[PDB]
Amino acid sequence: AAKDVKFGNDARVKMLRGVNVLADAVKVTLGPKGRNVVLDKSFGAPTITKDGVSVAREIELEDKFENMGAQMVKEVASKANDAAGDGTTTATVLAQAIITEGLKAVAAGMNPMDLKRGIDKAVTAAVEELKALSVPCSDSKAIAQVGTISANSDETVGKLIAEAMDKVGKEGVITVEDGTGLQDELDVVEGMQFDRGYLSPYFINKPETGAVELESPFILLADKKISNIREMLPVLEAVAKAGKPLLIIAEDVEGEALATLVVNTMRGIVKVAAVKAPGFGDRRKAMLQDIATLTGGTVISEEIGMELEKATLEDLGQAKRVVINKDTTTIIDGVGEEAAIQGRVAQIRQQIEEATSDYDREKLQERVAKLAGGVAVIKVGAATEVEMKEKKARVEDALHATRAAVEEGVVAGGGVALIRVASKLADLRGQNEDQNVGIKVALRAMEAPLRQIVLNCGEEPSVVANTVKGGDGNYGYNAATEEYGNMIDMGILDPTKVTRSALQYAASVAGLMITTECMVTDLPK
Amino acid sequence: AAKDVKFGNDARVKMLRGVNVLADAVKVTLGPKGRNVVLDKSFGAPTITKDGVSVAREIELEDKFENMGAQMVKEVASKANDAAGDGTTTATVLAQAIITEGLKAVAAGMNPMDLKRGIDKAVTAAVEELKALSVPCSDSKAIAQVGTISANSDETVGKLIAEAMDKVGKEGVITVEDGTGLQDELDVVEGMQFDRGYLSPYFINKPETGAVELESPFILLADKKISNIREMLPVLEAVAKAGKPLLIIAEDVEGEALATLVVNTMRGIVKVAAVKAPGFGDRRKAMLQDIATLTGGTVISEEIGMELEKATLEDLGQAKRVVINKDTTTIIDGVGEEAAIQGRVAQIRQQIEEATSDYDREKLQERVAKLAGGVAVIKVGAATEVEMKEKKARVEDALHATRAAVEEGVVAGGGVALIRVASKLADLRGQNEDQNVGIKVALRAMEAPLRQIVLNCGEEPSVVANTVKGGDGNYGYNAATEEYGNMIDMGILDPTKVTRSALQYAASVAGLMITTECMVTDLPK
Amino acid sequence: AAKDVKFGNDARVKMLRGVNVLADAVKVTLGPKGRNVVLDKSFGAPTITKDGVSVAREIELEDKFENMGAQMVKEVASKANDAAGDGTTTATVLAQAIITEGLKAVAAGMNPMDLKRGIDKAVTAAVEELKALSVPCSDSKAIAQVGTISANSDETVGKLIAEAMDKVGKEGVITVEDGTGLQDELDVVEGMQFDRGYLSPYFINKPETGAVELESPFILLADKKISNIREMLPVLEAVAKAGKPLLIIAEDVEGEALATLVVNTMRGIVKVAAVKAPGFGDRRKAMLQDIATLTGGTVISEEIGMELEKATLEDLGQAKRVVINKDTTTIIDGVGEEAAIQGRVAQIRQQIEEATSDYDREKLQERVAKLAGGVAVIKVGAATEVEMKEKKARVEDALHATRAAVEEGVVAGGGVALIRVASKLADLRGQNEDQNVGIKVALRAMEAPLRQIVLNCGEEPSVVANTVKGGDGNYGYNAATEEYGNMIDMGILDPTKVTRSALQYAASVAGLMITTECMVTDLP
Amino acid sequence: VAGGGVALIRVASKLADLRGQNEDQNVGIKVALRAMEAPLRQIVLNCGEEPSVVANTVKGGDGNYGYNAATEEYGNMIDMGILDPTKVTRSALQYAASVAGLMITTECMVTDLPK
Ligand SMILES: [Mg+2]
Numbered sequence A, B: 001a002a003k004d005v006k007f008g009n010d011a012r013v014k015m016l017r018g019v020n021v022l023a024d025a026v027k028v029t030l031g032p033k034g035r036n037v038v039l040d041k042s043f044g045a046p047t048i049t050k051d052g053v054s055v056a057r058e059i060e061l062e063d064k065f066e067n068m069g070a071q072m073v074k075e076v077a078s079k080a081n082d083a084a085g086d087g088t089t090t091a092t093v094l095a096q097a098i099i100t101e102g103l104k105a106v107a108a109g110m111n112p113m114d115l116k117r118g119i120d121k122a123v124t125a126a127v128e129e130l131k132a133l134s135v136p137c138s139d140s141k142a143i144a145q146v147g148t149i150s151a152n153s154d155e156t157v158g159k160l161i162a163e164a165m166d167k168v169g170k171e172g173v174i175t176v177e178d179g180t181g182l183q184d185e186l187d188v189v190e191g192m193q194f195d196r197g198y199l200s201p202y203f204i205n206k207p208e209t210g211a212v213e214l215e216s217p218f219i220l221l222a223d224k225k226i227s228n229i230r231e232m233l234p235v236l237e238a239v240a241k242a243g244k245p246l247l248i249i250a251e252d253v254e255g256e257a258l259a260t261l262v263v264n265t266m267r268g269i270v271k272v273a274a275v276k277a278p279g280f281g282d283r284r285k286a287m288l289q290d291i292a293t294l295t296g297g298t299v300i301s302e303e304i305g306m307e308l309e310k311a312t313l314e315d316l317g318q319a320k321r322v323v324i325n326k327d328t329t330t331i332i333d334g335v336g337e338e339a340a341i342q343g344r345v346a347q348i349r350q351q352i353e354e355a356t357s358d359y360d361r362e363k364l365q366e367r368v369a370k371l372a373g374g375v376a377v378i379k380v381g382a383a384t385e386v387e388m389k390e391k392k393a394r395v396e397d398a399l400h401a402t403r404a405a406v407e408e409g410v411v412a413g414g415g416v417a418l419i420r421v422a423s424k425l426a427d428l429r430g431q432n433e434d435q436n437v438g439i440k441v442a443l444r445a446m447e448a449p450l451r452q453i454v455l456n457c458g459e460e461p462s463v464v465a466n467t468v469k470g471g472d473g474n475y476g477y478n479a480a481t482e483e484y485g486n487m488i489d490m491g492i493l494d495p496t497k498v499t500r501s502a503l504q505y506a507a508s509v510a511g512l513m514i515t516t517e518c519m520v521t522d523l524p525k
Numbered sequence C: 001a002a003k004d005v006k007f008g009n010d011a012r013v014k015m016l017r018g019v020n021v022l023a024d025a026v027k028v029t030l031g032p033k034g035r036n037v038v039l040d041k042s043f044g045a046p047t048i049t050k051d052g053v054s055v056a057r058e059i060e061l062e063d064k065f066e067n068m069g070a071q072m073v074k075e076v077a078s079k080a081n082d083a084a085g086d087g088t089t090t091a092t093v094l095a096q097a098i099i100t101e102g103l104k105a106v107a108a109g110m111n112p113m114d115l116k117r118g119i120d121k122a123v124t125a126a127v128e129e130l131k132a133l134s135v136p137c138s139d140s141k142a143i144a145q146v147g148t149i150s151a152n153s154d155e156t157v158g159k160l161i162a163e164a165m166d167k168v169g170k171e172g173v174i175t176v177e178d179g180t181g182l183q184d185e186l187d188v189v190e191g192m193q194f195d196r197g198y199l200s201p202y203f204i205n206k207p208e209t210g211a212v213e214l215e216s217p218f219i220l221l222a223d224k225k226i227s228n229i230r231e232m233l234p235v236l237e238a239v240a241k242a243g244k245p246l247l248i249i250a251e252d253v254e255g256e257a258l259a260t261l262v263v264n265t266m267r268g269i270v271k272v273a274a275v276k277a278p279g280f281g282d283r284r285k286a287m288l289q290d291i292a293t294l295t296g297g298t299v300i301s302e303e304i305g306m307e308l309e310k311a312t313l314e315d316l317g318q319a320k321r322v323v324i325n326k327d328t329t330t331i332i333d334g335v336g337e338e339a340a341i342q343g344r345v346a347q348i349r350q351q352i353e354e355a356t357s358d359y360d361r362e363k364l365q366e367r368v369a370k371l372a373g374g375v376a377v378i379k380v381g382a383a384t385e386v387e388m389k390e391k392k393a394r395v396e397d398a399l400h401a402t403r404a405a406v407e408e409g410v411v412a413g414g415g416v417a418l419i420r421v422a423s424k425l426a427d428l429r430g431q432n433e434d435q436n437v438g439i440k441v442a443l444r445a446m447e448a449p450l451r452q453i454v455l456n457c458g459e460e461p462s463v464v465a466n467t468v469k470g471g472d473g474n475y476g477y478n479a480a481t482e483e484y485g486n487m488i489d490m491g492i493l494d495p496t497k498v499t500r501s502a503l504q505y506a507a508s509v510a511g512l513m514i515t516t517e518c519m520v521t522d523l524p
Numbered sequence D: 001v002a003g004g005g006v007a008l009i010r011v012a013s014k015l016a017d018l019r020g021q022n023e024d025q026n027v028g029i030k031v032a033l034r035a036m037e038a039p040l041r042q043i044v045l046n047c048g049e050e051p052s053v054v055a056n057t058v059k060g061g062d063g064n065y066g067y068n069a070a071t072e073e074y075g076n077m078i079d080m081g082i083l084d085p086t087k088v089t090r091s092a093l094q095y096a097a098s099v100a101g102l103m104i105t106t107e108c109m110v111t112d113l114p115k
């Protein structure tokens, strides 16, 4: 189709305008005195939310160029929330700040490529300063504290998370489910988690978490690329009886197969979800068997001459629950017999002895850690279904935060960490003046979050920011109480992972837009 | 009347657009391969010129704001031509360059006041480097050389100027008049010059020199402020009868008096020109008498009770010619008797002996030096009236240039001097980053003249400019021959006073416009 | 007032469009098969003419920029007609050709200044080739022939001019007046001519010749610059009585004085014309006296303390007629007494003996040559007033042509001389490629006249032009008879001065316009 | 051959005396030789340096001497590791000239209406 092409400043201003609509819409929710955004549905009453992720999802602009701008920031900003479970809004606010001053510089005559390098250098330096400022989170006392803070000052949640990590470890897999009653429950069952997400966002049945949940599903394990639905009919019909969901773990699912599964599942004829098999090559084949042994199913390998048409319900494995998001898939409580699993774990441990390479042993040690490690299940209890679902949400959110805290620690929240690091990089310089400007652009951008939070509170941002710079360490401004002091002590903090991710992703998109000279899109026609 | 008010960038862009029209029209004539500008003169066929001063005079824009911009640069740029007799076009090109980059910086967020200070610092430093680069012009050989170059390689003119300065000295008064025949003539006649210009630019009858020339005029000497024309009627009627011009030397001429003289003179009923009396206070009264004794007139002092109504032709003094520009007044060949002048000279010499103060003696020494000094007159000869007028013009122009060369010397022309000084100020810095930008704005602007000259020649400016910076001293590019070398030796040079004035004035207006936040003018109605 | 400014190509295209209107309108009359142009008159029926000068004078465009273009070409093209009495149309066609291809080159990326230099070099070379191709015109037989050809093959006119030049010389002053009867007459009266034209084109009363004629006028001689009309009143009133015209010969006439004279004369209040005094400085003073002695008037010198208010009719000189054009002024039959004139001639001859310098002698010899030389007067006779005026016109035109022929000779006409010279400069080159283009632009432009003439005839220009180049010398195409041969022999020729001036002026303006980057004019 | 668009500007510099059968063909030659500077000039432009200056300096050298846009240093391009298969540069130029030659010699175009 005929395209509309724009260049230089004309394109960059369009891109910026789009990012402003996105940022200006999400940044109203930032801080403890954040405002509400009303999202229309028409299929009912409008939604009122302070969740910047919810707002961002809805943002799409009519102007094709402006839209491209907003969609580029959204994409990258969302990755921050996927990594640490928070920071999408922060990343968006940072991106806006970097792009705004960045383009101003480009217009002044600065070299875009140098500006980018200046920014990137300021960021790498900022991340290093974040590590220095970071406070560890190791002992269970700390884990409980971070969990409590992340749970809106609920000591219960903090305790639950602490106990859960004490069973499966810090690197262990932890899941959250609905409670059976008032009492909370914690059990460790046979399960596994691998880094593979849904193959289509249309499988999502829990839009709130943006994940796919399957109750008592069958699991198909095929070591082939499924492209046609013809070979699936016999298995789909067998799953259509007994009325249970189906998880397809194959080398890949594409073409007609994927499409048909996407449609049929949305029509509600058969609940199905598909994900790629973990790893690649020989390792993929081996891990598919790990899943098989764990779920008590048999792998349908065309390599040995098996067909998918000859696949019976007996060939399918099964578990109690499956949780699939954009990046990970979690199998909970496999039907695999303890004898069979322990048997394969011992088999792999034998392979660790015969291992010649260190690499080979580390990869095997990873597979045994999954199979033997299991999965922790937290059943959140309450009086009332409403209270139960609500608490469950806080537990899931607090869990993600705590995990991130155990990885890289915690730093002052309220956007203090960023303005602190920025203040320590005043003497940072580059190879030329253009890069120097890029550095200053980034350092001034790191004040955006704090200033926005203060603004929402109705206080003078410049004054607060100026005072916070005066102090050192995790000294900052508690926007909630309007008191200065140690942010960590006051309980206002963020996982170092969150702040880091937000900044790095923000700078990623910002750097790309600053170095854009041409945009191509379709015509309004 | 109702006013139209603009602020900030809105105002500055309007101002800039106006300066561009001015600059872009004048800078096409810059250099030896300068282009022609066609100026329409409805009364007759159009004028074709390469004189940037002629072009500038005609520039007036429809948009009131844009016009204000062009008129501000015109006013200040003309002052460079009034001081050194050249550099108006160079100043205009510089002004454009400083304003353009200056406003770009302001839009970037730079502090206007700091930009100005940065610019001014770069200029003061540039002027000092210009002094260092300057080559003196003292000996008559050099004076003849500079005069020849300024006369378009006419050795005759160089000689004439050299001889004239050898009679009256380097600080001597030299005038140029029409020749009586083929032979050139040099004589010293009774005359004086004082630092007072026309009271209205509407007295100008010689627009190219931008001066007022009166042939065999009467001179009125009144020690009072003339505000009404009623008191002038009897004198104006007496002057209307001898069919001769009138120059009025009074304390001041304002109000109706000035207006009536402006109109009546433009109508051509009676040629009249007015200037203030030289000096102030008691000294003014004394110098008015010097003029009286010299012109053979009587001064009409209201202090003793004399009135302007009883002023007869006998009270008025007279000379052969009077030349008046924006700054100076020159009376040539007064009718005063030798006995009367020598009488007052001896009288003042008596006051030098009674002088108690050094200051008082120096002021008296100045008035005797004028009365006794006289004026040197160069009569330019030729074979034709056309050739005579033409040569006379080159002599007048070469005279101004040579005088300026004797004051501050000469530097490389073709805009080399500017790019040379700029290259020596790379390490110049200010108090903050904003000032640093201001410095770089000015240094980059100093390349405008050269680059423009090269552009008119059809060569790559960036390459030539780059090569010129590579050299040192008065090494540059001769745009005429396309050869590099010593500019002074090749005969391409400019009085150090010209280049200096052009830059300082250019920076003056540029600095004012950069620090403008509001503009007020009338409505299009 | 606010101005409208244009730059670069935007300005040059406007300028070109204006030149095309001018050129396209005038070039239709070029050649023996030239077309008519109808010029509208506010009062009366329209004028039908083949005179490109008449057409040019009427051309003025509504677009201010386009107009500037047309007026620039007009101004310079007219100078060619002032110099040789012909070639304004030719200059206009050349200008068009040079500008058209010139701008095309500029747009191609060629350097305007180099293009100009290339053109100028081609012209200087072309002028030299014109001199070489030129055929002298010295003997009376030749003078009569050139005069006859310029008079539309009238042997009578050729003879008249020949006789006239035989009396006063080749550098003599010759005038033409109305005849008193059928017989032509030729007499030499005391008169003088100096190189000073009218100070305002509004003094023109004979628009055909573009000159000013005054019958039995008074002559005011003042050695001062007249700027006010106050000092003229007493003299103007005295001239208003006796109802005769007034010629003002002063150092200069400007400001109110000039304006008032311009208006009063166009209102018919009193017929007045003003010109500057000849020469400058001391020489000017001396020549004013020559005119005084010749016209029998007195010079009003303010230097000795004379005033213009005390000027009587007795102080004014008088002649039988005065002819003033843009460049020259001619005083015919002064009332000065023979004793007074012969007296001053002898006085000047005495100054020649006391002359130390050669320059001084030459200048004195020039003044005596005017006073003693006199002026030849040709009274054109005919049977009817209509035939008399008609013949008089042909005599005046043929006279100018013959004069120009005696100065620089004659070359082939019909635009052959230009195309001939062009063909001999094929190997001419410049300092760079841009200059080379400039040269070719000029050489190709020199074919414009011939091609236009052939076009008006309805023949293929490229074919004729191609054939003419094939020959040599004054071999060309007679557009009238459609036969090739020696142009001079066939009687188709132009004064070398005409063709030269036309080309040089054409290239002058063309060069200026090609090197124009800005234009300034008033708003609509 | 040297990369960074040096090879093209180098070859072009060695063909200054190349002439054709008439002036028009001579212009065509100059058009091509000036066009071979496009790649380098563009690369330099993207780097934020003066193309005319760099191009001018590269012509000054000989062989595979050029400008390393990355490091801003001049020298042997092959040694510095900036190069392109001779087949690439050749193909790029020949195909570029192919279409360019066809469009220059186009007098008519036929296409459907906006409907
Ligand atoms: Mg979260």
Ligand SMILES: [Mg+2]
Residues within 6 Å of the ligand: C084, C085, C086, C397, C400, C401
């Ligand atoms: Mg004629």
